[PDB]
Every structure is written in structure tokens, then in C-alpha cells.
Write a protein that binds this DNA or RNA. Structure first.
Ligand SMILES: [K+]
Ligand SMILES: [K+]
Ligand SMILES: [Mg+2]
Ligand SMILES: [Mg+2]
Ligand SMILES: [Mg+2]
Ligand SMILES: [Mg+2]
Length: 114
RNA sequence: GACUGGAGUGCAGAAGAGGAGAGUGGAAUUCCACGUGUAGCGGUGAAAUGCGUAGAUAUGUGGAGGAACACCAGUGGCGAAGGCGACUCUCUGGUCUGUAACUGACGCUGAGGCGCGAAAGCGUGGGGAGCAAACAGGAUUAGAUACCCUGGUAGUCCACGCCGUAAACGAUGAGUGCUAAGUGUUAGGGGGUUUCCGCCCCUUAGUGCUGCAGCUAACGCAUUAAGCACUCCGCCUGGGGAGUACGACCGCAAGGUUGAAACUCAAAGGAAUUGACGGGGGCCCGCACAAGCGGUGGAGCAUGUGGUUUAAUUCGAAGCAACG
């Protein structure tokens, strides 16, 4: 009711933004597809902003003033999404990383055009 | 017979992902269960196949399973090479530095043999999370038995045993000595100075950069020589056929090692130079685009050209650069 955590999964294809409680129960989420986009336009900072805003202004169901934000992936829309979450009318307390880095564990798939 | 600069042992130190075994750690991919949780996720140049209201995607908790080990990590270390990176222990190999104690040429190479030997692959039995040949579906395309997407078996991992190939490459055989420098870097030693620290110089074995002589067809090599010399081995004698055929040996097999001729060609090739080109880069320009104006292509006619039909339909011009 007072504070939440935001998880953004930004990738070179789409941006998901989920607002949850600090001990990890979902209240809301959104993405560019639920926002109404269909192609590469999903992958844009504008879609990132819009999905962020929809997420936060539904998170004001049970209400909050403060967010801790956690950013995942190489998607370029993290700046726009964080600006959205600051400017929607919430006090983003801190930003942090969820870069899922293995210490050379399981290997990636192949490069493209090979 | 004698000696020690080679070679080796001893003695005092130093580094190290050198190898085998056993055990061990946490990231992190996947999966199982459970909450929260609502309609998308994924992917592309666009998509679609596919997963998803029988509830995902995500988010947290806990658990299972295997594979590889970020930072350190560096033209840095070690190793004969292949290659070796998480940690600890055990068992082991080799290298360098200093000494001049010890032996006293005991050495260098090395046909034929013996072993090792990336990855793929083969046999048996496990394991199999990811990635993934083959394959299926979806796109692409003129077609696509491909690139591209979603899935995915062999495999990849282990034990044991085979296979013994490689752009297995520094495309540069092992050994010895000699022939200018400058500079990093690693492991050591010696000395001058200084409170150690720190700076400096000399030297040993490595590893890299740049360069003198000299060599080289040149590119370039240059005390880590492709220099100057000696020993030993292996290999070459135009291209292709052909690393084929016969033969032998090895191999469960796949296939490997050894290795020709007939026939055919008049070249094949290396390095470098000048251009031209480039679905390479960079800089600059032109109505070249873009921004705009008005037009052609549509209609009718004039003209020219083509094709044709003609006794003849004179000849010439033919992408830009022929066709009022
Ligand atoms: K096997
Ligand atoms: K190699
Ligand atoms: Mg193998
Ligand atoms: Mg224009
Ligand atoms: Mg007209
Ligand atoms: Mg004419």
C-alpha cells in the first residue's frame, strides 16, 4: 500500500513491467502487447513508457508512493520506463540490476547467419 | 692415461591452469511443487510455426538434475606437442637461478621400432541440464533438399577400449657456437645508494615489440634469424590424374599408413606494381536524389523508328551517346 518493487524485463523484442509487493506477490503488470502493439514497435522506448505508465496507474489500486526498480536485459527502453515510473507520480527509491549473468555455465545458442 | 667450459649428480632457493585420482563451492540455464497473478509471450527484415484462460509470460520461496567454471585474466605461466583456467588433499613429472662440492665426454641426432596425440566418429553401460548435426513445421525464394524462426534425435559428459586425422600452423626440424642496438613483461641472482621502501647498473633462462649488418624474388627474418658455420634426421624435383589404383600392414567399422603408372596440359604457382571493380570504408561534387513546379505513359493528331506487308516500300543511325 506504501511501497512496491518494479521488475522491468527489457529486451531487443519487447518490454514487460511488473509491479509487485516487496515479498513478491503480483498486483499488476503490463507490456507493449497488452498496450496494443504488434511488431518491432513493441521494442521501443515509447512502448516502454506507455506500458510503465499503465502498470503504475493500475498499481495505484492498492496505492503506493515509492518504488524500487530492477532492470533486466539489454533492452533500450529501460531509461524511458524509469522516467515513466518517476514521472507518473511515484518516488522511485533506487534502481538495481537483474542482469542474469552466468559465470560461464550453460552455453548460448549459435550466432546468426552461420 | 690425465683435465674440465660440454653432459649429468649433489647442495640452497624460486615460479607454475604440467599430468592422474578423490572430494568439494556458488553463480547461472532448464525442470517439479506452491503462493501472488491476467491475457499475452516468443521471434523477425516483416512475419508465421509454437507456448498460453486445463493459466502462462513474469515474480518469490523451496527442491531435483547435470555441463562449464566470470572477476583475477595479461602478445602472462607450464608442457615435447596435442593442450592445460573454480577450490582442497594425495601421487607424480619437468624447468630455471646460484655453487664449483662430485663423476669425468658419460654427448648430439636418430632410419627401422614404441608410445602419446584436438575435435569428429566406433563398441559396451550409465548420465543427459543446456547447445545441437539429421529431421519436422513455419518463412524466404523463381525454386531453397540453405542462411532465418520455433522445436528437436545422434552426439556433446563420464568409465573402459578403439580410431591416429587436422589451417595438428610460428605453414619456420633437433643440437652447438658466433654476429649491433632500443624497450616492455615473467621467474631468479649479483652489486652501489638509501631507514627498509625506492631507484640504478650487471648477469642467467623465458616471452613479446621495433630495428643495424647480413640474407631473401619480394613480403619480410633480424641474439626467440628466414644471418654466419658444423653434425644428424625427415622431405621436394612441373600442374592434374592422385593421395587415386594394385599390393602389404593396421582397423569391429568409418577408414588410415606406404604409394605408382597410362593419359592429358604448356603452363601451374609465390611475392609485389599499376589500374578497374567491390551488395568494403572514408571525404567531396553534379537537378543525382530529396523538397517543389509542370509534364510523358491514358485520349486524338504530327513526326520518327521497329515489325509486317509491298514491284519498290532507297540508304544510314541503334543503352546512356539511335529513333521531330
Ligand atoms: K559413445
Ligand atoms: K593449435
Ligand atoms: Mg571425442
Ligand atoms: Mg524529386
Ligand atoms: Mg499518348
Ligand atoms: Mg530506315
Amino acid at each position: 500500500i506504501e511501497s512496491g518493487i518494479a521488475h522491468i524485463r527489457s529486451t531487443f523484442n519487447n518490454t514487460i513491467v511488473m509491479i509487485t509487493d516487496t515479498h513478491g506477490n503480483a498486483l499488476a503488470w503490463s507490456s507493449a502487447g497488452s498496450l496494443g502493439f504488434k511488431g518491432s514497435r513493441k521494442s521501443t522506448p515509447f512502448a516502454a513508457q506507455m506500458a510503465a505508465e499503465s502498470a503504475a496507474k493500475s498499481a495505484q489500486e492498492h496505492g503506493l508512493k515509492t518504488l524500487e526498480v530492477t532492470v533486466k536485459g539489454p533492452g533500450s527502453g529501460r531509461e524511458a520506463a524509469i522516467r515513466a515510473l518517476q514521472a507518473a507520480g511515484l518516488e522511485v527509491t533506487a534502481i538495481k540490476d537483474v542482469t542474469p549473468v552466468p559465470h560461464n555455465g550453460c552455453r548460448p545458442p549459435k550466432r546468426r547467419r552461420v
